[PDB]
Design a protein around this ligand. Structure first.
Ligand SMILES: Cc1ccccc1-n1cc(C(=O)NCc2ncc(C(=O)N[C@@H](CCC3CCCCC3)C(N)=O)s2)cn1
Length: 340
């Protein structure tokens, strides 16, 4: 039942796509990759079409291609980007050299909702609720985002939010957890919870919480708010050199957040305290945060679903370039679209 394709020049390359997709036009000025908006003649809705770059040039390109298709095929949740379609003009494995991914077309990213102005407390509740609902789902599959920031979060006009990643699945360091920038090495899923705390502060105040000029300055701004490590945290660091280094960027106590977020909802301030903890073993989880009193008007414990298990064992394998290309071809052929 193979569709009829048509060719055109877009982004100075030949795009070849099913006649299903009409009125292609480049969007994002390069910020999303090679992406066009299009009209889906099957549904009457607009979609985003991404063309992958040199997908089987090398073992590293081939494994990156496979990884992104496996992640997108897994994600089935309202608050996470999903795969509407995946296609290739190739009629066989022999001629397989191009991959196209189709998602929802979003309206605006969170920088374009905030625009350096405060949001209302009710609007902040609704946005952060949806990010946490998405993160409960991703974390339940043992997937960590690792680069959450306003540019990777997007809404429609009804303010319905989805999580995406415009980088390489694993630019600015303003949203990065302190353990990552201190090279502490034993990361857990609450690196994403740190990023959510920074984003929530920014929605409430209209300003960046930790706008560091450089790597050193980023850590000094963090430690001025959250303080020098306590005795319980220092006991979990191996190297004398690492313990000296963190203490040399601090020598200062944790501030009370009630003194920093003047005018804010006291439940907002309590939740920010539980997200922005230096010791990642003591940081609140996505599931715990959804039950916090700050989200009473939105929380439904019966509609905060978890993921099917995600087999990540390919990440440990060393395969030949034609093997990664064949595994990718099989995943295109096996795709089942979501319901109309
Ligand atoms: C028009 C607009 C306006 C304002 C903001 C955003 C948008 N906008 C851009 C797209 C888009 O590029 N869609 C095509 C895509 N293919 C692939 C995508 C993607 O997110 N891969 C991830 C997938 C895996 C992650 C895993 C963590 C959770 C999020 C998905 C990756 N880098 O491998 S997104 C849709 N809407």
């Amino acid at each position: 039942e193979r569709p009829t394709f048509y060719r055109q020049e877009l982004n100075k390359t030949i795009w070849e796509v099913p006649e299903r997709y009409q009125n292609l036009s480049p969007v994002g000025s390069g910020a999303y990759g090679s992406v066009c908006a299009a009209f889906d003649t099957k549904t009457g809705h607009r979609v985003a079409v991404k063309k992958l770059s040199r997908p089987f040039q090398s073992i590293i390109h081939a494994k990156r291609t496979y990884r992104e298709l496996r992640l997108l095929k897994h994600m089935k949740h309202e608050n996470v980007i999903g795969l509407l379609d995946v296609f290739t003009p190739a009629r066989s494995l022999e001629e397989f050299n191009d991959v196209y991914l189709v998602t929802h077309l979003m309206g605006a990213d969170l920088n374009n909702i905030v625009k350096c102005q405060k949001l209302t407390d009710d609007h902040v509740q609704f946005l952060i609720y949806q990010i946490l609902r998405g993160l409960k789902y991703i974390h339940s599959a043992d997937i960590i985002h690792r680069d959450l920031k306003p540019s990777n979060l997007a809404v429609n006009e009804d303010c319905e939010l989805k999580i995406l990643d415009f980088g390489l699945a694993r630019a600015t360091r303003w949203y990065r957890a302190p353990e990552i920038m201190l090279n502490w090495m034993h990361y857990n899923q609450t690196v994403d919870i740190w990023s959510v705390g920074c984003i929530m502060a920014e929605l409430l105040t209209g300003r960046t919480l930790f706008p560091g000029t450089d790597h050193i300055d980023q850590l000094k701004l963090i430690l001025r708010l959250v303080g020098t490590p306590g005795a319980e945290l220092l006991k979990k660091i191996s190297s004398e050199s690492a313990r000296n280094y963190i203490q040399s960027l601090a020598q200062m106590p944790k501030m009370n957040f009630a003194n920093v977020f003047i005018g804010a909802n006291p439940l907002a301030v309590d939740l920010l305290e539980k997200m922005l903890v230096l010791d990642s073993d003591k940081r609140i989880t996505a599931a715990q945060a959804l039950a916090h009193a700050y989200f009473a008007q939105y929380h439904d414990p019966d509609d905060e679903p978890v993921a099917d298990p995600y087999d990540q064992s390919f990440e440990s394998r060393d395969l030949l370039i034609d093997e990664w290309k064949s595994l990718t071809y099989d995943e295109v052929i096996s795709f089942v679209p979501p319901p109309l």
